[PDB]
Structure 1
């Protein structure tokens, strides 16, 4: 099935805009490009490719692609130095597996601090400031901060700020023997979170929908969330802004970064066409804008178009928190790690475990991450 391009992308992306780029590529080359948005595409792709079928190009979060590459399902991509120079260097980091590039970065996503400009026109630059801020707001019938404490993705930026990390990352490789989740930095960040809860500035039970409800009805001055939340805040009419996360111990909060990426199916007989399409049609200002026009990509990896889009301070902030954070590791071990950390944060925040006990357990999981 040579001579064409079949592309899979998720249904919450601008697939109709990507279809217009496919139509331009066909006008110029005569090669037909078909864009599909299957349900469950990231589960379906290894099922169909592993028997040398599937699309020629697949778009998904970079972290799943480690999995695919481990199974030999993705081609090494081959952009020259001049092409790689057009994207932010930290993005190339996300699409490396065994020192080889395995996908093109497209867009970048990370948490930011979202604030209610009517309640809080000058938001805090530091975590250490938030308790006093909370006191002032509580006197007005409001609170300083609510965010999801049930999922450790949302709490991680504070945990990593003073030096906590998941898996040491050096020379383009994760050392899974070297876990940083119980080091002195991680303990200090988590102890700060636990103290906030002990001191009634936050509630251990708060989850994604409680925090979103409070922010969007103007009951709390701040929340921590990502660009997937903006359109709900737009519906609410809150006058919000989006900014840099606070520092802790004078160091930046470090959210994990998700890189929407495009990989080439190892079994495609159309690898050269895929490279030309991605490098010369999609990853240019005109190509990304065709997609963005349809549904906003957020912050993008291509520097020239990101600079254009970053006139929107919300998008500038996303990129700013992303460059201060770290790439989500693309290794299969992350899912056991996230399960152990999630228990750790819940147990420390409830009083069930101390911070030191909780985190030692996350670093040294034993059999704890084999469910059920």
Structure 2
């Protein structure tokens, strides 16, 4: 009597698989038939069993999800595995017990059938082109069989280092390079090892942004910089200086329109004005921002959504945003322009420059599968095109995309602001820094702490 298992393959969590174990003898003679699993480096774990008496038992993990069935005609025991999970992943073995005639019994085993539950999970921000990133992921599943789900959870920059440390979290994490040094110091990211030929496809300056202590900690995707987005119909010759916005606002408020609406909550949007001169520069830049809210030119709790919506609706003449925001404007019927950020105290407003980068989670089993996705499928002409047609990436890191980038007037304006700004250091202290600026700007905006007292608490 020999037991032969079948139906073992790769599947997506939530999917299904029917294991079948056929014997070379009648199942009637068997007392008990059942399924055991063995994951790498672990003990035998019974999942299900069926006795000659038709009673079926299951282990608590698989209970409710798996059903053990039997067909005495086909001389086969089945395991219908529904709603699969990564914890299920193991080698599944078929077992049969037979009482002899005398007191003793016989245990019979099979070859084993491998079941792999694999899901490629990607964490990217909701303001980016996750739908397009999914279209790349859909082509990956066609050529391999691995599922590529794209998730966009709130506060992922500070949810990733908590979840990825303890739990599983994502396989690959997408965020501007500045947050990655903190992940690298903490040991939350795998070292990137790309071959020369892949390495050569991207601009050498882009690789520098994704380097911490002489180790590549991510894959560079695109350079991001804030620009001044303006409605050409409401404002044909927009302000070249910050100091002439109050005058323009007085003019526009008479006609039931705002001058400038942008995200005041997130400090990345307010930093260019703050850092225009520089300290004395931070005091100057912020006082101006405070005076705008004090003169009722800007709203106190202006966030990403009400600013975006207001510009797209045609209520505000200007807004401060990144490449990613353009597609939503195109959807609306607004003749828009992207240009240089306004100057403050003569000198330019220095926006921080981000390099969108993809890193592999140190606690991921799919490190080689993610490297394949990132190199051969995402960081390709075809791959970046898909992401870019959803929501624009900005100035891509791919060398082959220079011609297409250069043909776009908005990219030109983005690069103009990126040169006037500076790339963020990747250092672990960036997190504490950003938090210090986030509070400082909110406190001064609402009317709690003074501009002098804001820089005091922030420098500490």
What SS does structure 2 have at the residue aligned with 1:7? strand
Q: Sort the Cα spacing of 1:326 and 1:235 in 2 relative to 1 into closer, same or farther, 3 A.
A: same
Shift of 1:345: 2.4
Whether the 8 Å contact between 1:25 and 1:31 is mirrored in structure 2 is yes
Q: Shift of residue 117 of structure 1?
A: 0.5
Q: CA RMSD in A?
A: 4.1
What pairs with 1:11-50 in structure 2 (closer than 5 Å)?
A: none
CA distance in 1: counterparts of 2:437 and 2:153, whole angstroms:
32
Residue 322 of structure 1 corresponds to which residue in structure 2?
418
- Say whether the 8 Å CA contact 1:284–1:305 is kept in structure 2: no
More off after superposition, 112-121 vs 220-229: 220-229
Contact 1:56 1:270 in 2 (8 A): yes
Q: 2:132 and 2:454 mapped to 1: Cα distance?
A: 47
Q: Could you say what secondary structure the match of 1:96 adopts?
A: coil
Higher-Rg structure is: 2
Q: In the alignment, which residue of structure 2 is the partner of 1:66?
A: 181
**C-alpha distance in 1 between matches for 2:388 and 2:178:** 22
> Following TM superposition, by how much is the alpha carbon of 1:119 offset from its aligned partner in structure 2, in angstroms?
1.1
Greater mean deviation of Cα atoms: 220-229 or 72-81: 72-81
Give the secondary structure class of the aligned counterpart of 1:359. helix
* TM-score computed with the length of structure 1 as normaliser: 0.70
Which structure shows the higher strand fraction?
A: 2
Residue 134 (structure 1) aligned with residue 249 (structure 2): yes
The gaps in structure 1 that reach 5 residues or longer are 162-182, 361-372
Equivalent-residue separation in structure 1 for 2:260 and 2:328 (angstroms): 18
Q: Cα distance 1:75–1:120, how it changes in 2: closer, same or farther (>3 A)?
A: same
1:138-181 alpha-carbon deviations (Å, 9 max, x no partner): 454433222233332221111111xxxxxxxxxxxxxxxxxxxx
Give how far 1:340 is off: 3.0
User: Is 2:219 the counterpart of 1:123?
Assistant: no
Counterpart-to-counterpart distance in 2, 1:55 and 1:151 = 24
Q: Distance in 2 between matches of 1:275 and 1:141?
A: 52
For 1:151 and 1:351, locate their aligned partners in 2 and report how far apart those are by CA, in whole Å: 17
| Contact kept in structure 2, 1:153 and 1:256, CA below 8 Å | yes
Structure 2 vs 1, CA of residues 339 and 80 (structure 1 numbering), >3 Å: closer, same or farther? same
CA contact (8 A) 1:6 1:33 kept: yes
What residue in structure 1 maps to residue 17 of structure 2?
A: none
Structure 1 residues 113-122 or 21-30, which shifts more?
21-30
Normalised by the length of structure 2, the TM-score is: 0.59
Partners in 1 of 2:319 and 2:395 — Cα distance? 20
Deviation at 1:120, TM superposition (A): 0.7
Q: 1:252 aligns with which of 348, 359, 364?
A: 348
CA positional deviation for 1:121:
0.9
The structure-2 alpha-carbon separation of the partners of 1:29 and 1:141, relative to structure 1 and needing over 3 Å to count, comes to closer
User: Offset at 1:118?
Assistant: 0.4
Asked if the contact 2:327/2:392 (under 8 Å) is kept, the reply is no
Aligned residues: 336
Q: Identify if the C-alpha distance between structure 1 residues 130 and 98 changes in structure 2 by more than 3 Å, giving closer, same or farther.
A: same
Moved more, 42-51 or 339-348: 42-51
Q: 1:209 to 1:296 in 2, by over 3 A?
A: closer
